[PDB]
Amino acid sequence: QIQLVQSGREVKNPGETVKISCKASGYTFTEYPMLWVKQAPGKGFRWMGLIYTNTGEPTYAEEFKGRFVFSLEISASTAYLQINNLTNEDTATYFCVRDYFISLDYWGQGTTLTVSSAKTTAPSVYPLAPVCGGTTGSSVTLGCLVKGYFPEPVTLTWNSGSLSSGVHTFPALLQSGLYTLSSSVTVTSNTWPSQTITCNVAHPASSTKVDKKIESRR
Amino acid sequence: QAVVTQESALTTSPGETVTLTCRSNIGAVTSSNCANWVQEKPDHFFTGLIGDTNNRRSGVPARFSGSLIGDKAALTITGAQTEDEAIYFCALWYNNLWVFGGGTKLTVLGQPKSSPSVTLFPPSSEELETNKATLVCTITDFYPGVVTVDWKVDGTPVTQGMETTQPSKQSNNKYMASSYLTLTARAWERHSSYSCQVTHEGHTVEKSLSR
Amino acid sequence: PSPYVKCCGTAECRTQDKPEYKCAVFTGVYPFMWGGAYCFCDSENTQMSEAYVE
Amino acid sequence: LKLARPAAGNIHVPYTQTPSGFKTWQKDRDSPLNAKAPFGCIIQTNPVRAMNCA
Amino acid sequence: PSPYVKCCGTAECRTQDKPEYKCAVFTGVYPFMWGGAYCFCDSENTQMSEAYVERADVCKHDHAAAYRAHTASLRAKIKVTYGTVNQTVEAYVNGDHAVTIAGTKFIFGPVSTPWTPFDTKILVYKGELYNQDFPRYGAGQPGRFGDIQSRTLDSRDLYANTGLKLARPAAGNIHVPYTQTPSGFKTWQKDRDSPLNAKAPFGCIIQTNPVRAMNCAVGNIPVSMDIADSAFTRLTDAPVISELTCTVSTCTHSSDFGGIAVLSYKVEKSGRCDIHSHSNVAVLQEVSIETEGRSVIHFSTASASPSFVVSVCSSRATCTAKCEP
Amino acid sequence: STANHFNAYKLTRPYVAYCADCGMGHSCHSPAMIENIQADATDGTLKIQFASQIGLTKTDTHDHTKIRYAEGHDIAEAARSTLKVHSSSECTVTGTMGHFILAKCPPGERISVSFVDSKNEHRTCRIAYHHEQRLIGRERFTVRPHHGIELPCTTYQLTTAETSEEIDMHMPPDIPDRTILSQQSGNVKITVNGRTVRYSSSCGSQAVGTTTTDKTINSCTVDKCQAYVTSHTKWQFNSPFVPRRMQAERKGKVHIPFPLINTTCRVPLAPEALVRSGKREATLSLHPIHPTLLSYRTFGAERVFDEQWITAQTEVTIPVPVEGVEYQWGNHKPQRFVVA
Amino acid sequence: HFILAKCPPGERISVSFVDSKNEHRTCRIAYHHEQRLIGRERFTVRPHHGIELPCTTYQLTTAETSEEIDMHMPPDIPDRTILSQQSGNVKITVNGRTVRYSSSCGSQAVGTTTTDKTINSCTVDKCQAYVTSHTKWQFNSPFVP
């Protein structure tokens, strides 16, 4: 059916429209039509609408009406479940789905947006390795500590983008409109922090990203 | 058009199954209606564990299957394996959407307890030379979701700027997080070392980096 | 008579037989009533209108 | 009777017609010759005859 | 409003803010109504009755405009074929606007047109034009056409001689009757005259998003074409026409095509042939002329005795004929 | 008000109306008063102002069944099927909300509102209104059905309201009367009843004091006493029967239902014509349709622009000069011909 | 299929039915019912018996056969609202009209049955639940596709 890739974590100012993007490909983009998601966590199954658009009937829901408006360049299943007139209450997943197997059988990846009519600092990635005590024993989890990122996305990743799964990465917590976290890639005692286990601390809300080798304390 | 309110956990055990019926407000979830009941995942989960009101829908395993069950789109989760935790959306069809509500707490048991280790780095001078000195301890590999990662900034409890890493809500029962006891450079000199006392899975051990 | 539904289909114009015969097909019909799908596409529409004065 | 290319959705059989001249020959018919029969004729038509032709 | 009963007692009637704020202390009111005593005594009970002239709520629905008209100016779209150039220039045709042609400068205007749909005052009403005599701003007769003073379309005052007329009303039933004017806006539109949108003098087509008269068949457009010879085809590469002999195939009296004109001509080379004949009595069917031979042409001419001095390829001839009936 | 119309209903209680047109000669405080009519329509829905809560339940519910209304006690309501509009016959009921009710009536001399549940077989009234449909177009018939032409016609809004135009839902009123009291000949007795009760005796506590309940006054002569009933917390607008001697002039908010928008009309196109062109003159024979205007207007500096009631099977010689004419007879673009 | 009756004078006659009729479901057409009676007189009053003229009376009894209006061949006329589906999950049930079974891809184009079926690999609006008939048919279909 509709093989839907969802949009990113959106960063939305007040009054605008936030198109939860969709690559709803692999099948007919009308065969997997615009099934909008506007799902909060409190909503669970959240209103964005349903459409198998093989004949052409894509609808915004009750949750996809008002604040929602379903649009798409749906030829490859390119989609935007738009938070239209999206205020500071625009933080929700504008999510993909396709009408086939009459509910959203083919489904999307989701585009979780943070709506907010306010500013945001850029996330600086500092080289935060493990200390000189230990830090190359069994392993080392060194990386880019991403401080003060706003809007989405402001996180940390490991291995220069390559070897960081299994490493300690914290999601950015709110402080002054910034996200505070880190991404330390976790390798062995020759890898962390001797070998190339680079942390990227990236705040794209200010468009800064520091990808440096998460090295030892000395 | 009904918000799918149902059994709050339409989930089963490890090897166990939960057959709840989440009320989409008119009746059963349908197949031309497309209403269902199944464990989809979180994170903007476009995937029906059970849609189409007689079995699992597209995009989920069929064992957490939709039904016209009870007074709802039925989440008959038979085959609750180790990764069975999700939003068991039991909602009703209208021919355009299987409308779910807040999700039954879909469970398949598995992933028993094995707590995280707080692997530390001290409040180092790469940021602490500009006064950004967070003793950052990855509290990783948690089981279950119980790791009290508190500040032990060189013995003294770092409680100004201390932020503990949490576990991740995954299906496999694993977690990982990063907790920085965030003093200044004078706090990195004032407290002794960046250390988190992590009580993960029942075990309380103070893991520190070499500040 | 009941007109030629073309939804789709550019139908022909057959010869009417009566003396009051006026036959024709106004193309591009778009019938969307409460009675069942005759038009299933935006193109090929045609209304076969034939009349006999008697 | 001149056909008209009808409107969408409904099956409007557009057919602009003539008036009712058979209505016109009677209604809006003139003063009929049974009145104004000169000679004082008795114009009756089982067969058309002026009985009492004076 | 609800009349102030003073039972007994003369209720005072201070001045309201209404445009026709007439209050009268109709004393001696004997209020006998349905549901509880507005009078309990014998005399001195009365009703102070106040009414006020106010605007309609359908002014936002529909207004009536009495515009005093200033000057107007022609604006035209002339389809111009300048050789192989074809473009319709739509510019302000009063002579000031230098119309940028494709390599040309049209100057349509300054045209002398006083024949316009301008009156002294135009009433516009729902698209209905009327060259109709508006009164003075706030001096209407009661029931005169245009009684409401409308200084602004969201204005603040209202002149009106359509006055209410209160009285000591009918006893018992609460009737504060008010002898108002008959509605001139009910008359000046409803049972309004033959509208000035019809009856177009000069044969124009009036239309008022803004009130202007499209297709107004009046006068000739004075046009100055600043167009050089550096857009036209040069004389050194044109077909040298020779032996220009025109024919008279048939003569219509007043048809569009009019004449069968078979112009024989031997050409040095190929090219486009000009038709620009020097005859006011003729009209060329086109300026098109093809490679030479016997070029047939619709020799349009409204004159019955045609003699057209045709210009063909830089040569000329004089075709003669008699038209039809 | 229009969406939560029970809010504007529950603000001000309904009233009774001292209508003089009330049943063939009598007229009193019936519930079948009419406050005013609304004629903003090319389509022509009369927007009558109803005295009751027509389109509001007697318990203040949004009850499309409950055609609410007012007695002396507040809920003088019936079913909404008891509402009837008779202008020259039973006109089309269009829409109802509280005090507002619009509808498409036929031709008629007076529009008659009728409530028939207690108003015995439609207790009602017929206010005098010229219900004449001034139809647009060169033709003049009330024919939607064939595809004749679309015309822009300013029609009344036929939807539910939110707010456009504030009816003054205010004026806690007064009224006249003589009958609000009781008394056994030296015991003046008042009860709880449907008048906001002032006392007016020859002297006493039924000369000054509250009236919402039972009060006995010993030693009271019957010619002295009188119960008064005013209004409060809402009212009708200026009290057209409604003798509003209430001292506090103050207004409230109400919304008129469905203010007008630019709608359309199915214009009837007629049969076209028959041309006979003579020596500089033209003869258009028209066969007749439902009656219209046809206007012959010349082409040039002023030609004989005349109209005509095209209302029969006839012929008109529009004299087509060399400058020409324009033959507008019906619903076509009126372009006439030239000399030929 | 016809109803005969005497109506009042006029140019426009409405016809209504309310027995299950939609609030008295009615239409209103134009029909110049003007009483063009014979003779000099101008009224509908028999009672002072002086009039003995010919009259073109409508028949008051039921027929035997006089001339047939032709009803047969149950067609449809164009719509969009026959069946149900979410774009690969189509429900087609029993229906009040003879509904053709249409999809956007596959063999769903037609089929005037009242049979239940699930439909995949087709159009979400592409379900052409068609009009038809079986043992039915209108006269001429004036609006009537």
PDB file of C-alpha atoms in Angstrom, chain F residues 23 114-124:
ATOM      1  CA  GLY F  23     -59.129  37.266  15.072  1.00  0.00           C
ATOM      2  CA  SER F 114     -50.610  31.771  13.687  1.00  0.00           C
ATOM      3  CA  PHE F 115     -49.757  29.705  16.724  1.00  0.00           C
ATOM      4  CA  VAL F 116     -52.157  26.803  17.121  1.00  0.00           C
ATOM      5  CA  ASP F 117     -51.827  24.859  20.315  1.00  0.00           C
ATOM      6  CA  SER F 118     -53.708  27.084  22.724  1.00  0.00           C
ATOM      7  CA  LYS F 119     -54.465  29.861  20.245  1.00  0.00           C
ATOM      8  CA  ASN F 120     -57.528  27.944  19.214  1.00  0.00           C
ATOM      9  CA  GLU F 121     -56.834  26.774  15.690  1.00  0.00           C
ATOM     10  CA  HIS F 122     -54.077  29.320  15.066  1.00  0.00           C
ATOM     11  CA  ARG F 123     -54.513  32.299  17.346  1.00  0.00           C
ATOM     12  CA  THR F 124     -52.654  34.756  15.132  1.00  0.00           C
TER      13      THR F 124
END
